[PDB]
């Protein structure tokens, strides 16, 4: 790596691991256009297995990114609109809250109050039905952002209907496949069984457990240079061949509504460039980031911008990762852990790093 990269790395990630305990991390920094990739520590403590390159690390929410640019591939297969109802793909939702709520609503958490968690005791798809069909909403769609696995889950569940695949399969196809992105899974293969890091809660290694929706709203395993070159995919996506797929990149990032100084795309989130660093790192916190708050609708969407800070937080029980990138400065990072550690922690360090770096 440059020097000036290895410098602010180590400065930045040596504390951060420290202070939160982490037991193993990866960090990509992608600078003009190329990856730089730094490990530490363990993938497998008991097994004192480092994490390396090839480590899967569980992405959580981070899959939101992926299931909002499958979902914009999709509108733009003329497959679906995001101005279509909820009810044109799932007819069975005929309770009468369902009325007014439209595909763009779902993939933007503003359906109306739509919970952040899908019970554990749903399972089954007649479970799912029951459950949206006996929800009641806390305020008319298109007002509040309410940030839900419940609604962007379901928007990708249903947007994949007219393509007559899985939603698995049309990630497979779609997404990871024309990207060339084969150490990524939503079920990690026997071949990779090896490379799966352990995720550590209180200690005791965990990986996530199957849930309903699990596959659209936090399903993803990745490789530290799978999410290096999906951060290049999204930096860049005129480099992208499939027409469909580079248009789709576009949507994700393209801003529906905004609510203070943040704007919401498809699974991305975006702020104007230059930021407010105190803002960014404040609203991390999940006093604010999952708390409802007024969408100025913006009629009609504002495209991408250039002049952006996109990214994204996640986390499992065992997991916690970030991606951000600045489109204008071709700059991006991705930082992956085995420990869930506070959002503020994690968007702190990525400023440190990438504002040192333009």
Same mark, same amino acid.
């Given at each position: 790596?440059?020097?000036?990269?290895?410098?602010? @790395?180590?400065?930045?990630?040596?504390?951060?691991?420290?202070?939160? !305990?982490?037991?193993? *991390?990866?960090?990509? /920094?992608?600078?003009?256009?190329?990856?730089?990739?730094?490990?530490?520590?363990?993938?497998?403590?008991?097994?004192?297995?480092?994490?390396?390159?090839?480590?899967?690390?569980?992405?959580?929410?981070?899959?939101?990114?992926?299931?909002? @640019?499958?979902?914009?591939?999709?509108?733009?297969?003329?497959?679906?609109?995001?101005?279509?109802?909820?009810?044109?793909?799932? =007819?069975?939702?005929?309770?009468?809250?369902?009325?007014?709520?439209?595909?763009?609503?779902?993939?933007?958490?503003?359906? %109306?109050?739509?919970?952040?968690?899908? =019970?554990?005791?749903?399972?089954?798809?007649?479970? $799912?039905?029951?459950?949206?069909?006996?929800?009641? =909403?806390?305020?008319?769609?298109?007002?509040?952002?309410?940030?839900?696995?419940?609604?962007?889950?379901?928007?990708?569940? $249903?947007?994949?209907?007219?393509?007559?695949?899985?939603?698995?399969?049309?990630?497979?196809?779609? @997404?990871?496949?024309?990207?060339?992105?084969?150490?990524?899974?939503?079920?990690?293969?026997?071949?990779?069984?090896?490379?799966?890091?352990?995720?550590?809660?209180?200690? !005791?290694?965990?990986?996530?457990?199957?849930?309903? +929706?699990?596959?659209?709203?936090?399903? /993803?395993?990745?490789?530290?240079?799978?999410?290096?070159?999906?951060?290049?995919?999204?930096?860049?996506?005129?480099?992208?061949?499939?027409?469909? +797929?580079?248009?789709?990149?576009?949507?994700?990032?393209?801003?529906?509504?905004?609510?203070?100084?943040?704007?919401?795309?498809?699974?991305?989130? *975006?702020?104007?460039?230059? @930021?407010?660093?105190?803002?960014?790192?404040?609203?991390?916190?999940?006093?604010?980031?999952?708390?409802?708050?007024?969408?100025?609708?913006?009629?009609? =969407?504002?495209?991408?911008?250039?002049?952006?800070?996109?990214?994204?937080?996640?986390?499992?029980?065992?997991?916690?990762?970030? /991606?951000?990138?600045?489109?204008?400065?071709?700059? %991006?990072?991705? *930082?992956?852990?085995? !420990?869930?550690?506070?959002?503020?922690?994690?968007?702190?360090?990525?400023?440190?790093? +990438?504002?040192? +770096?333009?």
């Amino acid at each position: 790596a440059p020097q000036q990269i290895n410098d602010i @790395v180590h400065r930045t990630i040596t504390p951060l691991i420290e202070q939160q !305990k982490i037991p193993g *991390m990866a960090v990509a /920094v992608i600078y003009q256009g190329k990856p730089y990739y730094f490990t530490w520590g363990y993938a497998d403590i008991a097994k004192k297995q480092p994490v390396t390159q090839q480590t899967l690390f569980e992405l959580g929410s981070v899959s939101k990114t992926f299931t909002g @640019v499958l979902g914009g591939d999709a509108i733009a297969r003329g497959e679906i609109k995001l101005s279509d109802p909820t009810t044109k793909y799932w =007819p069975e939702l005929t309770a009468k809250q369902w009325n007014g709520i439209t595909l763009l609503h779902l993939a933007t958490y503003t359906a %109306g109050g739509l919970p952040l968690q899908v =019970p554990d005791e749903v399972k089954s798809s007649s479970d $799912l039905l029951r459950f949206y069909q006996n929800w009641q =909403p806390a305020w008319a769609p298109g007002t509040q952002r309410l940030y839900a696995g419940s609604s962007i889950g379901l928007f990708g569940a $249903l947007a994949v209907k007219p393509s007559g695949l899985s939603f698995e399969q049309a990630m497979q196809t779609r @997404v990871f496949q024309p990207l060339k992105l084969n150490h990524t899974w939503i079920n990690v293969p026997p071949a990779e069984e090896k490379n799966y890091a352990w995720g550590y809660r209180e200690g !005791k290694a965990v990986h996530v457990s199957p849930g309903a +929706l699990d596959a659209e709203a936090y399903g /993803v395993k990745s490789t530290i240079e799978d999410m290096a070159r999906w951060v290049q995919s999204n930096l860049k996506p005129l480099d992208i061949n499939e027409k469909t +797929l580079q248009q789709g990149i576009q949507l994700a990032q393209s801003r529906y509504w905004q609510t203070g100084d943040m704007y919401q795309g498809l699974g991305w989130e *975006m702020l104007d460039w230059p @930021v407010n660093p105190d803002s960014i790192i404040n609203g991390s916190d999940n006093k604010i980031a999952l708390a409802a708050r007024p969408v100025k609708a913006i009629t009609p =969407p504002t495209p991408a911008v250039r002049a952006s800070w996109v990214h994204k937080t996640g986390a499992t029980g065992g997991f916690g990762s970030y /991606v951000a990138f600045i489109p204008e400065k071709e700059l %991006g990072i991705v *930082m992956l852990a085995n !420990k869930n550690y506070p959002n503020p922690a994690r968007v702190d360090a990525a400023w440190q790093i +990438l504002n040192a +770096l333009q």
